[PDB]
Protein backbone atom coordinates (compact mmCIF):
# COMPACT_ATOMS: atom_id res chain seq x y z
CA UNK A 1 0.00 0.00 0.00
CA UNK A 2 1.26 3.59 -0.78
CA UNK A 3 2.15 5.40 2.52
CA UNK A 4 3.94 8.53 1.15
CA UNK A 5 4.67 10.04 -2.30
CA UNK A 6 7.02 12.65 -3.73
CA UNK A 7 6.24 13.91 -7.28
CA UNK A 8 6.85 16.87 -9.63
CA UNK A 9 4.59 18.12 -12.47
CA UNK A 10 6.42 20.13 -15.20
CA UNK A 11 4.37 22.24 -17.64
CA UNK A 12 6.32 23.78 -20.58
CA UNK A 13 4.47 25.71 -23.33
CA UNK A 14 5.81 26.99 -26.70
CA UNK A 15 3.68 30.18 -26.28
CA UNK A 16 3.10 31.94 -22.98
CA UNK A 17 -0.54 33.08 -22.40
CA UNK A 18 -2.29 34.69 -19.39
CA UNK A 19 -1.70 32.61 -16.24
CA UNK A 20 0.53 30.14 -18.14
CA UNK A 21 4.25 30.99 -17.85
CA UNK A 22 6.70 29.41 -20.35
CA UNK A 23 7.66 26.84 -17.67
CA UNK A 24 6.28 25.81 -14.22
CA UNK A 25 7.64 22.93 -12.09
CA UNK A 26 5.65 22.11 -8.88
CA UNK A 27 6.55 19.62 -6.12
CA UNK A 28 4.05 17.63 -4.02
CA UNK A 29 4.48 15.58 -0.83
CA UNK A 30 1.59 13.15 -0.28
CA UNK A 31 -0.24 15.19 -2.99
CA UNK A 32 0.22 18.54 -1.06
CA UNK A 33 2.05 21.22 -3.11
CA UNK A 34 5.22 22.29 -1.21
CA UNK A 35 7.66 23.81 -3.78
CA UNK A 36 7.46 25.64 -7.11
CA UNK A 37 9.79 26.92 -9.87
CA UNK A 38 8.57 29.20 -12.66
CA UNK A 39 10.24 31.00 -15.61
CA UNK A 40 8.89 34.41 -14.39
CA UNK A 41 10.35 34.35 -10.81
CA UNK A 42 13.41 32.32 -11.88
CA UNK A 43 13.80 30.62 -8.42
CA UNK A 44 12.71 27.48 -6.52
CA UNK A 45 10.48 28.79 -3.64
CA UNK A 46 8.64 27.21 -0.68
CA UNK A 47 4.85 26.75 -0.83
CA UNK A 48 4.61 25.51 2.84
CA UNK A 49 5.89 26.94 6.12
CA UNK A 50 7.34 23.52 7.03
CA UNK A 51 9.68 23.30 3.93
CA UNK A 52 10.62 27.00 4.43
CA UNK A 53 11.69 26.40 8.09
CA UNK A 54 13.48 23.06 7.31
CA UNK A 55 15.25 24.03 4.03
CA UNK A 56 18.54 25.99 3.82
CA UNK A 57 19.72 28.48 1.12
CA UNK A 58 21.68 25.72 -0.80
CA UNK A 59 18.44 23.67 -1.06
CA UNK A 60 16.62 26.55 -3.00
CA UNK A 61 19.80 27.46 -4.95
CA UNK A 62 20.62 23.90 -6.19
CA UNK A 63 17.02 23.42 -7.36
CA UNK A 64 16.97 26.87 -9.06
CA UNK A 65 19.84 25.64 -11.26
CA UNK A 66 17.89 22.49 -12.33
CA UNK A 67 14.74 24.51 -12.96
CA UNK A 68 16.71 26.94 -15.20
CA UNK A 69 18.31 23.92 -16.95
CA UNK A 70 14.93 22.21 -17.43
CA UNK A 71 13.34 25.37 -18.84
CA UNK A 72 16.06 25.55 -21.54
CA UNK A 73 15.86 21.80 -22.26
CA UNK A 74 12.04 22.12 -22.79
CA UNK A 75 12.42 25.09 -25.20
CA UNK A 76 14.76 22.83 -27.33
CA UNK A 77 12.45 19.77 -26.85
CA UNK A 78 9.41 21.76 -28.10
CA UNK A 79 11.30 22.83 -31.32
CA UNK A 80 12.54 19.21 -31.80
CA UNK A 81 9.02 17.68 -31.72
CA UNK A 82 7.43 20.41 -33.85
CA UNK A 83 10.07 19.65 -36.56
CA UNK A 84 9.71 15.88 -36.01
CA UNK A 85 5.86 15.83 -36.40
CA UNK A 86 6.17 18.57 -39.16
CA UNK A 87 3.40 20.40 -37.16
CA UNK A 88 1.82 23.86 -37.30
CA UNK A 89 3.47 26.55 -35.14
CA UNK A 90 1.53 28.19 -32.30
CA UNK A 91 0.77 26.46 -28.98
CA UNK A 92 2.36 23.11 -28.01
CA UNK A 93 2.86 21.55 -24.55
CA UNK A 94 5.35 19.13 -23.00
CA UNK A 95 4.23 17.81 -19.61
CA UNK A 96 6.23 15.62 -17.22
CA UNK A 97 5.19 13.78 -14.01
CA UNK A 98 7.90 11.99 -12.10
CA UNK A 99 8.49 10.78 -8.58
CA UNK A 100 8.43 7.98 -5.97
CA UNK A 101 6.10 6.22 -3.51
CA UNK A 102 7.09 4.42 -0.27
CA UNK A 103 4.98 1.28 0.26
CA UNK A 104 3.98 -0.46 3.54
CA UNK A 105 6.54 -3.32 2.79
CA UNK A 106 9.35 -0.65 2.94
CA UNK A 107 9.72 -0.88 -0.88
CA UNK A 108 9.95 2.00 -3.41
CA UNK A 109 8.01 2.55 -6.69
CA UNK A 110 9.10 5.36 -9.07
CA UNK A 111 8.44 6.58 -12.61
CA UNK A 112 8.92 9.40 -15.10
CA UNK A 113 6.25 10.04 -17.78
CA UNK A 114 6.34 12.71 -20.49
CA UNK A 115 3.36 13.83 -22.56
CA UNK A 116 3.18 15.91 -25.77
CA UNK A 117 -0.01 17.79 -26.89
CA UNK A 118 -2.14 15.62 -24.59
CA UNK A 119 -0.78 12.11 -25.33
CA UNK A 120 1.87 9.65 -24.02
CA UNK A 121 5.31 10.47 -25.51
CA UNK A 122 7.86 8.44 -23.46
CA UNK A 123 7.75 6.79 -20.00
CA UNK A 124 10.06 5.08 -17.53
CA UNK A 125 9.36 2.88 -14.49
CA UNK A 126 11.66 1.26 -11.86
CA UNK A 127 9.67 -2.03 -12.38
CA UNK A 128 10.76 -2.49 -16.07
CA UNK A 129 13.82 -0.12 -16.00
CA UNK A 130 13.58 0.87 -19.75
CA UNK A 131 12.06 3.74 -21.74
CA UNK A 132 8.75 3.03 -23.43
CA UNK A 133 7.95 5.01 -26.64
CA UNK A 134 4.21 5.71 -27.33
CA UNK A 135 4.75 6.29 -31.17
CA UNK A 136 7.37 6.55 -33.93
CA UNK A 137 8.57 10.18 -33.02
CA UNK A 138 9.19 8.98 -29.40
CA UNK A 139 11.04 5.89 -30.78
CA UNK A 140 13.81 8.27 -32.01
CA UNK A 141 14.08 9.66 -28.44
CA UNK A 142 13.97 6.14 -26.88
CA UNK A 143 16.91 5.01 -29.13
CA UNK A 144 18.99 8.12 -28.24
CA UNK A 145 18.20 7.80 -24.46
CA UNK A 146 19.04 4.00 -24.37
CA UNK A 147 22.50 4.67 -25.94
CA UNK A 148 25.15 3.14 -23.54
CA UNK A 149 22.35 2.93 -20.90
CA UNK A 150 23.23 6.52 -19.74
CA UNK A 151 19.83 8.15 -19.25
CA UNK A 152 18.25 4.99 -17.68
CA UNK A 153 21.15 4.90 -15.10
CA UNK A 154 20.48 8.56 -14.07
CA UNK A 155 16.69 8.04 -13.89
CA UNK A 156 17.15 4.85 -11.81
CA UNK A 157 19.59 6.42 -9.30
CA UNK A 158 17.21 9.49 -8.91
CA UNK A 159 13.88 7.56 -8.60
CA UNK A 160 15.22 4.58 -6.53
CA UNK A 161 17.72 6.32 -4.17
CA UNK A 162 17.56 10.17 -4.10
CA UNK A 163 13.77 10.55 -4.35
CA UNK A 164 12.86 8.24 -1.38
CA UNK A 165 15.72 9.62 0.78
CA UNK A 166 14.36 13.18 0.25
CA UNK A 167 10.72 11.98 0.71
CA UNK A 168 11.74 10.62 4.21
CA UNK A 169 13.33 14.04 5.07
CA UNK A 170 10.12 15.89 4.01
CA UNK A 171 7.80 13.45 5.89
CA UNK A 172 9.72 14.40 9.04
CA UNK A 173 9.66 18.16 8.26
CA UNK A 174 5.91 18.00 7.45
CA UNK A 175 4.84 15.44 10.11
CA UNK A 176 2.13 17.67 11.78
CA UNK A 177 0.38 18.83 8.50
CA UNK A 178 0.66 15.39 6.87
CA UNK A 179 -0.74 13.43 9.90
CA UNK A 180 -3.80 15.68 10.67
CA UNK A 181 -7.49 14.46 10.18
CA UNK A 182 -10.38 16.99 9.77
CA UNK A 183 -13.69 15.04 9.42
CA UNK A 184 -16.37 16.09 6.85
CA UNK A 185 -19.39 18.29 7.69
CA UNK A 186 -22.17 16.38 5.80
CA UNK A 187 -25.41 17.90 4.43
CA UNK A 188 -28.15 16.53 2.11
CA UNK A 189 -29.86 19.00 -0.36
CA UNK A 190 -33.02 18.48 -2.46
CA UNK A 191 -34.12 20.05 -5.79
CA UNK A 192 -37.75 18.79 -6.28
CA UNK A 193 -38.19 19.94 -10.01
CA UNK A 194 -39.79 18.43 -13.26
CA UNK A 195 -41.78 15.97 -11.02
CA UNK A 196 -38.39 14.28 -10.19
CA UNK A 197 -36.67 14.83 -6.77
CA UNK A 198 -32.82 14.92 -6.97
CA UNK A 199 -30.92 14.20 -3.65
CA UNK A 200 -27.29 15.32 -3.06
CA UNK A 201 -25.09 14.19 -0.15
CA UNK A 202 -22.23 16.76 0.15
CA UNK A 203 -19.14 16.15 2.31
CA UNK A 204 -17.44 19.50 2.99
CA UNK A 205 -13.99 20.33 4.37
CA UNK A 206 -12.32 16.84 4.90
CA UNK A 207 -8.64 15.71 5.11
CA UNK A 208 -7.23 13.40 3.97
CA UNK A 209 -8.93 12.64 0.56
CA UNK A 210 -10.18 9.06 1.40
CA UNK A 211 -13.98 8.98 2.05
CA UNK A 212 -16.98 6.58 1.67
CA UNK A 213 -20.28 8.22 0.56
CA UNK A 214 -23.15 5.74 -0.10
CA UNK A 215 -26.92 6.19 -0.56
CA UNK A 216 -29.22 3.62 1.15
CA UNK A 217 -32.85 2.80 0.18
CA UNK A 218 -34.35 1.15 3.27
CA UNK A 219 -32.08 -1.87 4.06
CA UNK A 220 -30.60 -1.88 0.47
CA UNK A 221 -27.42 -0.19 -0.90
CA UNK A 222 -28.36 2.10 -3.87
CA UNK A 223 -25.10 2.36 -6.01
CA UNK A 224 -26.94 1.16 -9.22
CA UNK A 225 -28.85 4.52 -8.99
CA UNK A 226 -25.95 6.49 -7.26
CA UNK A 227 -23.71 9.02 -9.07
CA UNK A 228 -20.49 10.33 -7.31
CA UNK A 229 -18.71 13.67 -8.02
CA UNK A 230 -14.88 13.67 -7.98
CA UNK A 231 -13.06 14.18 -4.67
CA UNK A 232 -12.16 17.84 -5.55
CA UNK A 233 -9.98 20.43 -3.76
CA UNK A 234 -11.04 23.34 -1.49
CA UNK A 235 -8.79 26.48 -1.51
CA UNK A 236 -7.69 25.75 2.12
CA UNK A 237 -6.09 22.28 1.35
CA UNK A 238 -9.22 20.23 2.38
CA UNK A 239 -11.53 18.24 0.07
CA UNK A 240 -15.16 18.25 -1.09
CA UNK A 241 -17.35 15.58 -2.68
CA UNK A 242 -20.94 14.42 -3.26
CA UNK A 243 -22.96 11.26 -4.11
CA UNK A 244 -26.28 11.96 -5.89
CA UNK A 245 -29.52 9.97 -6.61
CA UNK A 246 -32.91 10.48 -8.32
CA UNK A 247 -35.98 9.56 -6.19
CA UNK A 248 -39.77 10.00 -6.54
CA UNK A 249 -41.00 12.93 -4.40
CA UNK A 250 -43.40 10.53 -2.58
CA UNK A 251 -40.53 8.13 -1.53
CA UNK A 252 -37.98 10.83 -0.41
CA UNK A 253 -38.03 9.54 3.21
CA UNK A 254 -36.78 6.01 2.21
CA UNK A 255 -33.29 7.31 1.34
CA UNK A 256 -30.36 8.18 3.64
CA UNK A 257 -26.64 8.89 3.03
CA UNK A 258 -23.85 6.97 4.89
CA UNK A 259 -20.39 8.68 5.18
CA UNK A 260 -17.19 7.23 6.76
CA UNK A 261 -13.86 9.15 7.04
CA UNK A 262 -10.69 8.65 9.16
CA UNK A 263 -11.49 11.84 11.23
CA UNK A 264 -14.85 10.23 12.18
CA UNK A 265 -15.38 8.69 15.66
CA UNK A 266 -17.92 6.39 13.85
CA UNK A 267 -19.66 6.28 10.39
CA UNK A 268 -22.36 9.03 10.09
CA UNK A 269 -25.94 9.01 8.63
CA UNK A 270 -27.81 11.88 6.91
CA UNK A 271 -31.17 12.53 5.25
CA UNK A 272 -32.95 15.43 3.49
CA UNK A 273 -34.29 17.73 6.31
CA UNK A 274 -36.58 20.20 4.43
Amino acid sequence: MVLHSLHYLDVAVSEPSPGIPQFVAMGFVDGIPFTRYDSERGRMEPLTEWIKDSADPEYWDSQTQIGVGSQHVYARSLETLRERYNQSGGLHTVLRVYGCELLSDGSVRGSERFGYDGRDFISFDLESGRFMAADSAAEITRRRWEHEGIVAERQTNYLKHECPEWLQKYVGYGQKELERKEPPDVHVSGKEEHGTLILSCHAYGFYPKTIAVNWMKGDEIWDQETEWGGVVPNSDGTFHTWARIEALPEEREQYRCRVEHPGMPEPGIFAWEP
Binding site: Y8, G27, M44, I66, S77, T80, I140, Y158
Partner: peptide, 9 residues
Amino acid sequence: YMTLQAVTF
Protein backbone atom coordinates in the same frame (compact mmCIF):
# COMPACT_ATOMS: atom_id res chain seq x y z
CA TYR B 1 14.27 17.35 -4.32
CA MET B 2 13.88 18.57 -7.90
CA THR B 3 17.30 17.55 -9.22
CA LEU B 4 16.14 15.41 -12.15
CA GLN B 5 16.61 17.92 -14.99
CA ALA B 6 14.53 17.11 -18.10
CA VAL B 7 16.62 15.42 -20.80
CA THR B 8 16.15 16.89 -24.30
CA PHE B 9 14.11 14.70 -26.74
